C-alpha cells in the first residue's frame, strides 16, 4: 500500500504545516501537524476543555462506531516550546492520503497549553519519530508509520514541504518526480528516538565550504534551524545590522536587508537554503527589526533541521531495519 497527502502551510510565514487525516467511520477529517520530532498522535477531543478550544475541529470517539476506550492508558507531552498537552486514548481507523491503519492509538486531548489552544489551524499532531518515544502509559503505542510499515510498498515516507506553498507527504513510495539529481543518504542514529544524523559542514551565501560534523534531528515540527552558536554567529556577521536581541529572544535584522543563502552538507552533498527562506518578517506588526529563520541552538542541548532547512530538500525516511536518511535538492 501507499499513501499521499497534501500538507499546507498555516500562515504566510510557514510557521507550520497542515496535512488532513481521516479519523474514525464515518470519517471525521481533522488538520494534523506531521511532527518528525515526536511519537503520539493527539487530537482536539470532545474531551477537550471546553475554554481551551477557539476554533479547532474536534474528534468525537461516541460519534465512531470503530473507536474504542484503551482502558487505563493516559498520556502527557511536552515540548521543545514549552507548549503542552495530555489525556486519554481511544484506537480507532486513521487514514492518510488514502492509506489506512486499523488500530491506531488516537490519543485524546483533555488539557492542552495555551500555544494550542490560540492556534486554531492545528487539530492535533501526527507524531513520527520512533515509537520509543510515545508517551502512553502504562503500555507505550506505535505510530502511524509504525503501524503501517509492514503493508506499505517500501517501509519509508517521504517529506516534500513547500516554501510558502502546499506540498507532500508520501507513504511507502518515493516519488522520482518529486526532485532533482540523485537522493544522498545519510546514517541516522536511534539512541534517542529521533530521525537524528550528522551533516558534514555548511557555507554561508557565496562563502567556502566549512567542513565540521553537526549532529542533529530531521524535525518537520520545528519551524526553524537551531544551529551551534559559532555556525549561527558566522551566518548572521554576513547581514548588516543583524544582532542577538536578549529581549526577542534570538537574532534580529534589519527588514531591508536581503539575506545570504545557508547551505549544509549531506555526505558530499549540499542542500542550499535560498535567503528568502531565512526571513521570518517582523518581530511585532509594523516593525522595521525581522526575525531570523536561522537560530542557536545553545540551550535546547541538540541541533534541529526544522522546516527552514527540510523545505530546501526532497527528504527520505526511510525506516528499514537500520535506518537512514535521504536528501535531494528540488
Do not use: M
Amino acid at each position: 500500500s501507499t499513501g499521499s497527502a497534501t500538507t499546507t502551510p498555516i500562515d504566510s510565514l510557514d510557521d507550520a504545516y497542515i496535512t488532513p487525516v481521516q479519523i474514525g467511520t464515518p470519517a471525521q477529517t481533522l488538520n494534523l501537524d506531521f511532527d518528525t520530532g515526536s511519537s503520539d498522535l493527539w487530537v482536539f477531543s470532545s474531551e477537550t476543555t471546553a475554554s481551551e478550544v477557539d476554533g479547532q475541529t474536534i474528534y468525537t470517539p461516541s460519534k465512531s462506531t470503530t473507536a474504542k476506550l484503551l482502558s487505563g492508558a493516559t498520556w502527557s507531552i511536552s515540548y521543545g516550546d514549552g507548549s503542552s498537552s495530555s489525556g486519554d486514548v481511544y484506537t480507532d481507523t486513521v487514514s492518510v492520503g488514502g492509506l489506512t491503519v486499523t488500530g491506531q492509538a488516537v490519543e485524546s486531548a483533555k488539557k492542552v497549553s495555551s500555544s494550542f489552544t490560540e492556534d486554531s489551524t492545528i487539530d492535533g499532531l501526527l507524531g513520527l519519530a520512533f515509537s520509543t518515544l510515545n508517551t502512553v502509559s502504562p503500555t507505550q503505542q506505535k505510530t502511524f508509520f509504525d503501524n503501517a510499515k509492514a503493508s506499505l510498498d517500501s517501509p519509508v515516507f517521504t517529506a516534500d514541504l513547500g516554501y510558502h506553498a502546499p506540498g507532500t507527504y508520501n507513504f511507502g513510495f518515493i516519488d522520482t518526480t518529486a526532485y532533482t539529481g540523485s537522493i544522498t543518504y545519510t546514517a541516522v542514529s536511534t539512541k534517542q528516538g529521533f530521525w537524528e544524523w550528522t551533516s558534514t559542514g555548511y557555507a554561508v551565501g557565496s562563502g567556502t565550504f566549512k567542513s565540521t560534523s553537526i549532529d542533529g534531528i530531521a524535525d518537520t515540527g520545528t519551524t526553524l534551524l537551531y544551529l551551534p552558536a559559532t555556525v549561527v554567529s558566522a551566518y548572521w556577521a554576513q547581514v548588516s545590522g543583524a544582532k542577538s536581541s536578549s529581549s526577542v529572544g534570538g537574532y534580529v535584522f534589519p527588514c531591508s536587508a536581503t539575506l545570504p543563502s545557508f547551505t549544509f552538507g549531506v555526505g558530499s552533498a549540499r542542500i542550499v537554503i535560498p535567503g528568502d527562506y531565512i526571513d521570518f518578517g517582523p518581530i511585532s506588526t509594523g516593525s522595521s527589526s525581522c526575525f531570523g529563520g536561522i537560530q542557536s541552538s545553545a540551550g535546547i542541548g541538540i541541533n534541529i533541521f526544522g522546516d527552514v532547512a527540510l523545505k530546501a530538500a526532497f527528504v527520505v525516511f526511510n525506516g528499514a531495519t537500520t535506518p537512514t536518511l535521504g536528501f535531494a535538492s528540488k
